[PDB]
Amino acid sequence: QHAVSAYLADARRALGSAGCSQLLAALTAYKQDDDLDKVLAVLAALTTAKPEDFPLLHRFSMFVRPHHKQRFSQTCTDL
Amino acid sequence: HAVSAYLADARRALGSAGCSQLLAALTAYKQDDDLDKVLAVLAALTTAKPEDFPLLHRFSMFVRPHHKQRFSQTCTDLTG
Amino acid sequence: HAVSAYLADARRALGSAGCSQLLAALTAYKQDDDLDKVLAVLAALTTAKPEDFPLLHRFSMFVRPHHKQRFSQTCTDLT
Amino acid sequence: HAVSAYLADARRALGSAGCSQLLAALTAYKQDDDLDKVLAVLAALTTAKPEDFPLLHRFSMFVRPHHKQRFSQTCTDL
Amino acid sequence: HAVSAYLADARRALGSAGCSQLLAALTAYKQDDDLDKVLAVLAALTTAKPEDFPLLHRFSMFVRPHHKQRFSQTCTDLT
Amino acid sequence: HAVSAYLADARRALGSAGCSQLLAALTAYKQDDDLDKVLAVLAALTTAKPEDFPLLHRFSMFVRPHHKQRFSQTCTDLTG
Amino acid sequence: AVSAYLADARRALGSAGCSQLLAALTAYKQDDDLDKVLAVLAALTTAKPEDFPLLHRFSMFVRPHHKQRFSQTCTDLT
């Protein structure tokens, strides 16, 4: 219900333009290559530097393929 | 051994069929990532009586990090 | 005992989709206190066939004390 | 199975307030046997947009057998 | 009004002193949001005899939406 | 002696209560042939932490031949 | 719970903002003026939706006779 556009706007506000671009660049590489560790590593660097940004880590679930939900959760638990 | 203590408590409080229903819902959640559906099974089993409310709250150990905040809210609403 | 026996019977009679819809409606009721809305979900699922009418009646174990009399009356009218 | 699939589709297409209004009208019909009144709620909710028209027709599974002939005809005409 | 009917029934069943005690507790709840304290007055007054139990149940109309679950639970335990 | 090695590893990783819950579930499976129910106990105990995932996979030695492909699939889905 | 709130407030509002909020809390604890403390709180913590939890969690400081008004004001902002 526009969850994507709300995420993009929040990510731009919290990470700045360079960060929002880095995250989007990593997301489109994931959509092509299916490599979850590599996109989560970009995401973790950007959104777990401070605890107030952890919701952007969690909300990134909407872009994770269903077969990758379990690994996404495990990675999040470890962060 | 926090999991094994949970399963023992759930079997003792809910009985065998109830413990199984809850584990069945946990396995479906681990596959489908649908929090509302697993919480609905859990709430039916563990909020019939206040002495079982701890089992609702302690289920958090199985809840994925992206679902934890909504799980808390839901628990507060069912309990108070 | 009684909850798990109800859930097992509902899953067997309504199928897992139906049982989930019923449990979703029960959780909404536990939060919103709206008896008409939970009864309407229940009646749609459990009064399509007469052999499922016991599932309507037995749902009383989940009904709040201040709603029990209205729930009974409505159940007698449906059956 | 057909019931649960209908309820899932209705909740997804009408949203929860709409789905509730329809189910409220179904429960009134199950007690009062007034077909016009339940059809009127259904038509308001499910003919706003053409992609929801299937929900009008599929509602027949809840209609009592003596009402099925009128129900489909009226649905076709909408 | 359901309110005015409740007040009339409470005055008739509890008498004037009791109806006042209940209303004094209701006013404090509407300000302090302490459900246990108002329910304790209500339970004392309206579970003395079974014919007064409907006054316990019908008190729900004054209970805030976030407190309906605790109100139900307390009612289940008193019955 | 693959069984005894499994039981020793499970007792060390899951503790006594967990190892017992798993063996109780294994006995029920050996009698009732219900794979979903035994895997639900196993998944709860052995997929909370990734270092216990080998216990999930090695449980295949107990699975009846007609269940082996579904067992693998379910394991892959829970782990990745 | 207090120290966790102050830590969250310092991280989300910065040190000047956390101090403004504590100054407003102290004035409330002395003067019992709920509107004035809520006005400082609302300015600081409803600029962004991610800070709304700090508005809601502020209830732990609110005197019992003000609980209902605090909730209402929160709802009207959120």
Coordinates of N, CA, C and O in Angstrom, one line a residue, chain B residues 2 11 13 15-18 20 22 25 29-30 35 38 40 43 46 49-50 55-57 66 73 76:
Chain B
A2 N 16.8 -23.0 26.6 CA 15.6 -22.2 26.8 C 14.4 -22.7 26.0 O 13.3 -22.7 26.5
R11 N 3.9 -28.3 26.9 CA 3.3 -29.6 27.0 C 2.6 -29.8 28.3 O 1.5 -30.3 28.3
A13 N 1.3 -27.3 30.3 CA 0.1 -26.4 30.4 C -0.9 -26.7 29.3 O -2.1 -26.5 29.6
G15 N -1.2 -29.5 27.2 CA -1.4 -30.9 26.9 C -0.8 -31.2 25.5 O -0.3 -30.3 24.8
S16 N -0.9 -32.5 25.1 CA -0.1 -33.0 24.0 C -0.6 -32.4 22.7 O 0.2 -32.0 21.8
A17 N -1.9 -32.4 22.5 CA -2.5 -31.9 21.3 C -2.2 -30.4 21.1 O -1.8 -30.0 20.1
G18 N -2.4 -29.6 22.2 CA -2.1 -28.2 22.2 C -0.6 -27.9 21.9 O -0.3 -27.0 21.1
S20 N 1.5 -29.8 20.3 CA 1.6 -30.1 18.9 C 1.1 -29.1 18.0 O 1.6 -28.8 16.9
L22 N 0.7 -25.9 18.5 CA 1.6 -24.8 18.6 C 2.9 -25.0 17.8 O 3.4 -24.1 17.1
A25 N 2.3 -24.8 14.2 CA 2.1 -23.4 13.7 C 3.5 -22.8 13.6 O 3.7 -21.9 12.8
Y29 N 5.2 -21.0 10.3 CA 5.8 -19.7 10.4 C 7.2 -19.7 9.9 O 7.7 -18.8 9.2
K30 N 8.0 -20.7 10.3 CA 9.4 -20.7 9.9 C 9.5 -20.9 8.4 O 10.4 -20.4 7.8
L35 N 3.4 -13.9 10.5 CA 3.4 -13.7 12.0 C 1.9 -13.7 12.5 O 1.7 -14.3 13.5
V38 N 0.6 -17.3 13.1 CA 1.2 -18.1 14.2 C 0.8 -17.5 15.5 O 0.4 -18.2 16.4
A40 N -2.1 -16.1 16.1 CA -3.5 -16.4 16.3 C -3.6 -17.8 16.9 O -4.4 -18.0 17.8
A43 N -2.3 -17.4 20.5 CA -3.2 -16.6 21.4 C -4.3 -17.5 21.8 O -4.8 -17.4 23.0
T46 N -2.9 -19.9 24.6 CA -2.2 -19.5 25.8 C -2.8 -18.3 26.4 O -2.3 -17.8 27.4
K49 N -6.4 -18.6 29.8 CA -6.4 -18.5 31.2 C -5.1 -17.7 31.6 O -4.1 -17.9 31.0
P50 N -5.2 -16.7 32.5 CA -4.1 -15.9 32.8 C -2.8 -16.6 33.3 O -1.7 -16.1 33.0
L55 N 3.5 -18.1 28.6 CA 3.8 -18.8 27.4 C 3.6 -18.0 26.2 O 4.2 -18.3 25.2
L56 N 2.7 -17.0 26.2 CA 2.5 -16.1 25.1 C 3.8 -15.2 25.0 O 4.4 -15.2 24.0
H57 N 4.2 -14.6 26.2 CA 5.3 -13.7 26.2 C 6.6 -14.4 25.8 O 7.4 -13.9 25.1
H66 N 12.4 -8.9 12.7 CA 11.6 -7.9 12.0 C 10.1 -8.0 12.5 O 9.4 -7.1 12.2
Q73 N 3.5 -5.6 20.8 CA 2.3 -4.8 20.8 C 1.1 -5.7 20.9 O 0.2 -5.5 21.7
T76 N 0.7 -7.1 24.4 CA 0.2 -6.1 25.3 C -1.3 -6.0 25.2 O -2.0 -6.0 26.2

